[PDB]
Amino acid sequence: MVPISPIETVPVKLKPGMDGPKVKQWPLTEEKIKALVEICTEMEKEGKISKIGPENPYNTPVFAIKKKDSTKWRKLVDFRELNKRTQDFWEVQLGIPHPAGLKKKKSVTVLDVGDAYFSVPLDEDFRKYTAFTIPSINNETPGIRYQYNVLPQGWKGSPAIFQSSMTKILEPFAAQNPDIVIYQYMDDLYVGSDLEIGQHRTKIEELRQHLLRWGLTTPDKKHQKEPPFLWMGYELHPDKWTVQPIVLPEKDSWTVNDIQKLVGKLNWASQIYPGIKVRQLSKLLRGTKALTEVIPLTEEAELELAENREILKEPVHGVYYDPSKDLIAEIQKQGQGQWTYQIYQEPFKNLKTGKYARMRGAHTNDVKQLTEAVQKITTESIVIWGKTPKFKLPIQKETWETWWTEYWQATWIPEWEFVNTPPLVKLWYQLEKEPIVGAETFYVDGAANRETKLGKAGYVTNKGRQKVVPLTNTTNQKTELQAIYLALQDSGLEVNIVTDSQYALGIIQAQPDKSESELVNQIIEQLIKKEKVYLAWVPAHKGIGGNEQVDKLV
Amino acid sequence: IETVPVKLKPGMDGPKVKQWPLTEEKIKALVEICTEMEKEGKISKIGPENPYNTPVFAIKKKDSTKWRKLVDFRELNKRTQDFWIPHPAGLKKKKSVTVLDVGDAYFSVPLDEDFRKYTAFTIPSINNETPGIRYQYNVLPQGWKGSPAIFQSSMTKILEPFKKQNPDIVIYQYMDDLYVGSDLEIGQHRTKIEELRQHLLRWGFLWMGYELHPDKWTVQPIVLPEKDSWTVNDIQKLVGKLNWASQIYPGIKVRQLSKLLRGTKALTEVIPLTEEAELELAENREILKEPVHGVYYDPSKDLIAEIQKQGQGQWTYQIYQEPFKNLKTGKYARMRGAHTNDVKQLTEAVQKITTESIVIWGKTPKFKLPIQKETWETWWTEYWQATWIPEWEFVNTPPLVKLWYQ
Ligand SMILES: Cc1cc2cc(C#N)ccc2c(C)c1Nc1ncnc(Nc2ccc(C#N)cc2)n1
């Protein structure tokens, strides 16, 4: 007899105010009953479960399932009700590792730890909540009452406790062997290293020996899992990685569900396949909510799908992370609020790729979107590589300085260099800080009746120039914008504009180069064509001449 | 040697806040620190039966090459019970106030067992390749609201001799910070501070100090331009600013000044001031020189701080409780390694304003930052040097009242 260290139990309790499960046992066929009796008998032999007296008031339904029309049955304990009453745990499975942040390994061996699962004891004061009853033949005898002594499969706290205990066991080994890496997934332990294969095999045997200290025996045979590994949608190779084969289906008609699947695959493939666009395909799913509803594909979306098919023509792989080298992220504008980026260390050898779509809003510009993209890539990089990459952006230094030194908000971009690859991000207009000498002064105003929705928009100038335009189906704000639009239309290359609209000023001071509103867009187009524009604000109804509200009060 | 029972608020479970991404340097620092803390019995490893979590990261104090572990107990502090001192109003009237870091002291008092599970935190790994290292506190944690309240009884008896020996020096305590103010000469002030920290070290990094000058804290009144020739634009801006000031000061009139703008004139055209206009403007100045009517502080209300970016490294700010009722106004133009960084400037600004607010009223204000949420949340930790963390929201619409405060 060789003494093995007992595995420390995790103190598990039920949710406060809740009691254990008390679910009736379902009626079974004689066949299923005999099967379950045999199975639970051998399980009791192994020490997984134990017979309990009539005192235990709790019960969990147990079922028998015939495995794919075979000669053997299988036990299935429905722990749903117990899981509803079981406390929350610290799930470490949240946030899986990304392949782009991994380091290349010369050897990656896999060990089976399915037998190590049943060596993890359940908390003694909690076992009574895992009680279940095997129905007796013809219900003429008291049913057989069992309870779990180990972590029950399907139970809420099983994976967390298993992972925590296993980690606590492997910790000193991983600590005293820094030349290897150990990762746990399901019933499998993965060990990787760059050591010579002999030293590597030695390390593996030492790991098994270490696991023997807790009586954990791993199968003494070559595991059926060799590189590459299929993992969480990835293909993991020793020196490279990729996504599992993305197959875009051929269809003459597409439903909502089909488009959702398509955009799903595209989004998943966009992390290694550069240039993947999804806007024209995602904008077809605007307020549908009907998985069977067939939506006609626009030409704009058909073309996008075609381009996507061209990109996914041949397999593309990504390299692993080399901590000794510098990290670089380059960004390009795709238009329609779409952005794409690549993250690499050595040229033409991407660690990963990605994309960014503009947020939902009424107005926006390319500079803001670029900033947001930079922030996203930064956060993702800190997640994956633990540091900020050096950026290559399609924007002049002068442009950025002019932007952030004049922008009303505080904005910042980490260390970056300019890369001359069109379309470049630019400022399309720049309002003056002081009034313009010699330029005509356009006092503008707009006003609309709330009931009849009738309005007027117009201007008066110092040269005597005037205009008042009647409008139907409009609001106060729309008229106020319309006035500015008129002032921009009928003025020279340089113009001063006086408005009392805090709304319009609030929009133009945000400096958009694109908008949902056609009126604002027209205003922008007018702004771009100008040489100098000064926009001044004054309080309304304060007897300020020029502010001719009287031409709008009608 | 004995612990005081601590519980949460009725109907509230412990905090479950996610750990935000940490850089490599900060992770190494936090591991290195928490190792020694575990060796000293300050913290302990926990199992999967503890679902609670509080964000944690690392900083560097004012001019120091040693990392400091900082925990974001903001969620725990608003869920923990209200531990039930009248704020020293003389603290903001002293000539010099040195800030000390007496946080380590808290590590000498054991925390209530049944509460420890709530101070759980996680040191993350890069790319989550290894499981995160989980800890919980055995002693009073830094940054927690309960720590200064519990240690108060000890701190009092600790400072009794120094306080009895110096009845002029005003001492205040907020979180992990000890504000010590006096009217002594700066040298003698520093001697008293060093004497105090040596009085604390003997009593069982407290070597750093942060000197402030509340007497030199200038306030911002509302000022109007003084010109010899006024253009149409000048008068328009004047009328606008006065119209804004009318919401604060009642007697503000702009009628006569507005009479000058009648007729559609060019913005650059100079307009000679009439007598009624000049009189009106004068009266307006006289009104603006007076304090704001009916301005009081309410300890039960929230302090709100608004910040405006004025450009060229200049920022303006206002602390109030009710709209148009400023309890404090100010302006900054600091050059602290942030010549080409707006976010660093804004962060330092937030810290300064918060410090002032702690000195004056005894609690932190709720900030309204002129910055996008993502941008701020991405970078603010890289420039933070305070042991506390205030609350903040974001303003996405450009306020028209920017230039009026400049
Ligand atoms: C985080 C992780 C997940 C795994 C998932 C599987 C699966 N299925 C197998 C092994 C896994 C391993 C060792 C991991 N951990 C880890 N830490 C540092 N570097 C690496 N590099 C690495 C380099 C090539 C390969 C390959 N081929 C795998 C990992 N991996």
Ligand SMILES: [Mg+2]
């Ligand atoms: Mg009007």
